[PDB]
Amino acid sequence: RSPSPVDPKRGAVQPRYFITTSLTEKERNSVMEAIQKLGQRAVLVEILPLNTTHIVLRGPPRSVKALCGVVSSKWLVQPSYVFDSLGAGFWLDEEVEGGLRYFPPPLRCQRFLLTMPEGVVKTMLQRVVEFGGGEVVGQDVVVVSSGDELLRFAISRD
């Protein structure tokens, strides 16, 4: 988060399709109202809607939707990205605002060995791996014992 206070860097003038994840109802409604107020080709719109480009979340990626965004090259931005852009009068540059985007998709065509017992956590991680174009092994493998390990792998590629 480092825009210039004089001439803050403008983001590209193009459609932005926002969803939110794991926000409180109050913060979600505030984010929605700000997106609608700023406009300028942004819209608040499967695990992710097929038209998703941006995911608003508070804090680091933790939910299934946030992890699917990490591995499918969506922008992951804090609520401040929306409120700061409304304050500037235009959509700010996502990277200057501290937004996260991992390109190309970091799990694509990679094989993952989930060294954990069966359960909802394993199931969710298999869904994330597949959402990112990877394969879960049922040798060139990435061993994962936690979602944190998969996340740290996904953000450290290229």
Numbering used by the authors: 474 to 518, 524 to 616, 626 to 645
Verbatim from the authors:
Kinetoplastids (such as Trypanosoma brucei), a group of evolutionarily divergent eukaryotes, have a unique set of kinetochore proteins that lack any significant homology to canonical kinetochore components. We previously identified KKT4 as a microtubule-binding kinetochore protein in T. brucei (throughout this manuscript we refer to KKT4 from Trypanosoma brucei unless stated otherwise) (Llauro et al., 2018). KKT4 directly binds to microtubules and maintains load-bearing attachments to both growing and shortening microtubule tips in vitro. KKT4 has the following predicted regions conserved among kinetoplastid species: an N-terminal α helix, a coiled-coil region and a block of basic residues in the microtubule-binding domain, and a BRCT domain at the C terminus.
To understand the function of the KKT4 BRCT domain, we solved its structure using X-ray crystallography. KKT4463–645 yielded crystals that diffracted to a resolution of 1.6 Å. The structure of KKT4463–645 revealed tandem BRCT domains. The N-terminal full domain (BRCT1) consists of a central four-stranded β sheet flanked by two α helices on one side of the sheet and one α helix on the opposite side. The smaller domain (BRCT2) consists of two α helices and three β strands, missing a β strand and an α helix in the C terminus. No electron density was observed for residues 463–473, 519–523, and 617–625, suggesting that these regions are flexible. Superposition of KKT4 BRCT1 with the N-terminal BRCT domain of H. sapiens BRCA1 showed a good structural match with an RMSD of 1.11 Å (for 65 Cα), suggesting that the KKT4 BRCT domain may bind phosphopeptides. In fact, we observed additional electron density in our structure, likely arising from a sulfate ion that may mimic a bound phosphate group. The sulfate ion is coordinated by three residues in the pocket, T494, S495, and K543, which correspond to the key residues known to interact with phosphopeptides in other BRCT domains (e.g., S1655, G1656, and K1702 in human BRCA1) (Williams et al., 2004). Furthermore, replacement of K543, located in the putative phosphopeptide-binding site in KKT4BRCT with alanine, decreased the binding affinity by roughly an order of magnitude.
